[PDB]
Amino acid sequence: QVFFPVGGSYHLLSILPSTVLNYEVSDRLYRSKIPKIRLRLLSSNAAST
Amino acid sequence: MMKGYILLEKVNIENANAFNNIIVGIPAITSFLGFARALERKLNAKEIAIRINGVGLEFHEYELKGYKNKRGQYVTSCPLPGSIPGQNEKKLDAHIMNQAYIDLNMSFLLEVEGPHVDMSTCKSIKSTMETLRIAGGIIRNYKKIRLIDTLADIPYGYFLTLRQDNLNDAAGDDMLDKMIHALQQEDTLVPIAVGFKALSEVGHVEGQRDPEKDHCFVESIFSLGGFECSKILEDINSCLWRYKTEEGLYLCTII
Amino acid sequence: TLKSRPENLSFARCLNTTEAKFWQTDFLKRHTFKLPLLITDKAVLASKGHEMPPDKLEKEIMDPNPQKSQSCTLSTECDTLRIDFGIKVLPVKESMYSCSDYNYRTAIYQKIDEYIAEDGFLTLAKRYVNNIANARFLWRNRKGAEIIETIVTIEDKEYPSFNSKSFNLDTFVEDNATINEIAQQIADTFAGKREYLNIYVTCFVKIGCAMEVYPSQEMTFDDDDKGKKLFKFEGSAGMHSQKINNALRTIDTWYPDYTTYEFPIPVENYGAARSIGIPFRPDTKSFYKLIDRMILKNEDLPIEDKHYVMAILIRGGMFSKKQEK
Amino acid sequence: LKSRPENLSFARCLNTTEAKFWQTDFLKRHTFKLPLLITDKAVLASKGHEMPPDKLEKEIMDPNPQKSQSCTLSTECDTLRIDFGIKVLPVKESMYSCSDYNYRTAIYQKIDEYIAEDGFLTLAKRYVNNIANARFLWRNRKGAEIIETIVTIEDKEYPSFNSKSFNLDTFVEDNATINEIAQQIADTFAGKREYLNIYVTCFVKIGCAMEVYPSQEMTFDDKGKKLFKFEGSAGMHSQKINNALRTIDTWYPDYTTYEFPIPVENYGAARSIGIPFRPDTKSFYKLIDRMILKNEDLPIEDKHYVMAILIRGGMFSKK
DNA sequence: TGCTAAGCGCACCTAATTTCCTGACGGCAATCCGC
RNA sequence: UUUAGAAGGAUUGCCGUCAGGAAAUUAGGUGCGCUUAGCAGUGUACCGCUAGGCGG
Asked: CA-nearest residue of chain C to A38?
């Protein structure tokens, strides 16, 4: 959750990540040559979780 | 009142954030503008009214925390996770989530409009940039906080400007395909996180950090940007990232 | 009344250590000479000497085990190691970045100012300067050292240096003049009487001529390569800030069973050192119960428990309520 | 105490530095030293590898170009000089991880009992016997007129060693210099002295323009001979010096049949004699589960083996 | 305490060809799940 | 008011043995480096009679 300036006041923004986007990026960057980094961090147990 | 330009020269950020759902690299631009608004709100609390409305983002050196493999790719490291609040908080080994970290040397040119913009304000920023963080990283050291006049006192470095016309005028399909084709055509162009678009409506939910300010759920929206030298930058005002709001769009734009 | 903790209580660090960089020097020219220390790659041929099932042992006991590694050693003509790191001490009241309830903020600010009244962050600060002056931040680089010399430079004043082999790692001294001088400034920085404190620490460890230097190891998950990937900061060896900070938070000597195990542990929430695999403060002297007995069911806890709660709040973290659906 | 800790590990107690190679002349060996550098050597060969009968017909008279490297002395030098140094660290202050405190207390009690019986003196005498016989010169001990090993601790240069007068299958316990160095390593291992830095310099008179064999580096993917360069000059791995210093085990079950020492490993593996010599009840795992987990006064030879592995180190951790 | 000012530094033709570039064995154990 | 705030990656190791790079050669032709000037700036700084000022 972060704050964002809206017209002299502020709006709290709780950011929800996108699963489907990340999936589409991972599909469309295996078949490509733009700079890319694989994030080997999430184990299968936590991904199941 | 008195417009001016303050340059925070060679700020060395240590262990900033680098993950924005599909990006591992340069932090979000909302983070640097949040450093700006945090500097603004802490100066306006020492009774120094200074409204910061435009930030330049210059880059001198970087080090993504990790190593470069023999095949030329990047492997990103993480600190060992400690006690993380939850059901498994008493176990000695904690879960590892997606996280990336970067080290940056950056210079921030700010568009400052206050009653008086003098070198006392520069001393106030010096006494205010040692209790703040850029992205989520600590400031090890800064060179100098100085006032600049034109595009000649600016040191050498490569700014970040928004290149959306290289993304709207791209190959086809959907915006991800336009992005991938555009990054294939211009290899000196990077994806950048540029703000947020709402996924709900303004209202009060339970669990907020501040229970009295409005709240909206958001996704991050991303675009393209590129690097231009300090010598070859025309009339400044095109390296100045500024807040811009719409109905459902929380965007950081170079106008 | 206050019947819980806030739905989003957060705290920032108040002892912000920086990454370390390793240098190689001589000792009779340690104030003038400074050479870079680089991390080499050392590949090894080993034997499979790990424990395996008795069926796999008959098939693999005499099989070669090649492994990948990295190693940092000194030069053939420089006998000392120079580590230089910096800290950013910050106030405790001005490190609360988030709090939903206003009354909990008022109550916690009252309890921090009551701690400023009685022992105003001074015993904790003396313990943090002892963990600089015994050089606990030399984790495996403190073993096999002829002379260890630690120099602290607050602002621009260079304080008299420390003989870090004359301090015991399990006894905190409260009588050295240099430690008291540094600790009063750290205490005033934690109170809020100073808004920031910049401390720069430089160490000199005379291990020997071409001996092994031990940087911090990076957790890098790669499927193709699985080796000792050490930490390179700006091309040269170094240590993470978390390693040095975990060394400096080893000040807790107020756990329920200190008389048996007589060694300081790092200040964590449930008392979870990574050496001993049993939680050292798991129910009655944990931070969550000892802050819900301090702020919610008002009560004057003993000063050792107040030391532990304040040391957690200097460590900082996500300290909210058991989040519900 | 049931079962070893989930995170149990030990650090080395004999830290050996990487070795640097030099060239001298033997009558000028105390006043003159030059760098020895590795030279690339591309070699053309015949196809002498064993091939199946449908490949030999096509590739028996085919040229075999191969890349390689070599180290050779100069035409004016007759002696190789190897310089390394050893840091001796205490044994109780070497457990890097132990999740149980009772197991730490039991290990410290059994090490203190060993200090009571033999103050790490037989092990240290064997280590100085593998410094004095010059076993760290692996293929550089073959074909040498005179080998002189000098040992320097602090600022005292101990009397030099005629390394060629030492059999490699026996261990001398009556040499004054070996006993005097081994007593210092013994007191360092025990705890009386907190550290000991021992610097070794060995002069190998092999001859003029003869070959010096460094340590070859390991290649993993799909290679040629890459030899070790320590600070530009040729050199050897610390691993190779330590595997020649831990060749002290004459306590395995089948010693009376094969009467030579082997390096001290967990399952008793020896790559020279390609047989495991400690595959069962006389291995470290079953001698540390019968010394601390089920208290039993082991024989003294087995105690020598357990303390020798606790000087070697490793991840001895149960699931 | 000075050490010069001025012009300019080629046009052509090309840069080989054969045979090949090793065989072995092996590449760790632990831990990183909320409900 | 910053995808906010928090985090010890650790311990251990033998890369080895072996080798024919080799045979042949045309680099050539051609050419304007010129003009001019104070080693001057006093060219030196000593011989005597506490700090300071003085015969020739």
From this structure: C222
Q: Distance between CA D263 and CA B117 in Å, rounded?
A: 75
Q: Which residues contact C222 (CB under 8 A, 6 or more apart)?
A: A40, B69, B75
Could you count the other beta carbons within 10 Å of the beta carbon of residue B2?
12
> Which residue type is seen at C134?
N
Spatial separation of the C-alpha atoms in residues B111 and B236, rounded to whole Å: 11
Estimate in Å the CA B122 to C1' F35 gap, whole number.
62
D181 C-beta neighbours (distance < 10 Å), count? 22
- Three-point CA angle D188, C228, D82, nearest 5°: 50
Q: Assess whether B43 (CB) lies less than 7 A from strand F.
A: no
Chain B contact for C86 (CB, 8 A cutoff):
yes
- Is B85–C318 a contact, with Cβ atoms under 8 angstroms apart? yes
Structure-determination technique: cryo-EM
* Chain C residues with CB-CB distance to D285 below 8 A: 51
Exposure on the CB side of residue B139, measured as CA atoms within 13 A: 24
Query: Please, how many CA atoms are within 13 Å of residue D111, restricted to the half-sphere of its CB?
Result: 21
Other CB atoms within a 10 A radius of the CB of residue D21 amount to: 26
Which residues does B130 contact at the CB level (< 8 Å), separation at least 6? B139, C88, C195, C196, C198
Report the distance separating Cα C13 and Cα C86, nearest Å: 14
Instruction: Report the residue of C7, C98, C99, C221 to disrupt the A interface, i.e. the one with the largest count of A CBs within 10 Å.
Output: C221
Distance CA B222, CA B28 (A): 9
Asked if residue D43 keeps its beta carbon closer than 7 A to nucleic acid strand E, the reply is no
Distance, in Å, from the CA atom of C206 to the CA atom of C141, rounded to the nearest integer, reads 10
| Nucleotide nearest the Cα atom of C49 (by C1') | E28
Say if the Cβ atoms of C222 and A1 lie within 8 Å.
Answer: no
Q: Helix or strand or coil: residue C191?
A: helix
> Do C173 and C59 contact (CB within 8 A), yes or no?
no
Nucleotide nearest the Cα atom of C68 (by C1'): E27
This PDB structure is determined at a resolution in Å of 2.9
Look at chain B and count its residues. 255
The C-alpha angle B80, B27, B71, rounded to 5 degrees, equals 70
Q: Which residue has the tokens 């592995």?
A: D309
Structural contact between residues C67 and C46, judged by C-beta atoms closer than 8 angstroms: yes
What tokens were used for C51?
């424990």
Question: Are C110 and C38 a contacting pair, CB within 8 Å?
Answer: no
- A33 CA, E15 C1': Å apart: 37
Q: Does residue D254 reach within 7 angstroms of strand E, measured from its CB?
A: no
Nucleotide nearest to B20 (CA to C1'): F3
First to last CA, chain A: 22
Neighboring chain D residues of C208 at a CB cutoff of 8 Å = 17, 85, 87, 197
Q: How many CB atoms lie within 10 A of CB C116?
A: 18
**Cβ-proximal residues to C324 (8 Å cutoff; 6+ apart), any chain:** none
Give the pairing type, strands D161-162 and D43-46: unpaired
CA dihedral (D189, D192, D197, D201) positive or negative? negative
Residue D173 pairs with which residues in a beta bridge? Answer: none
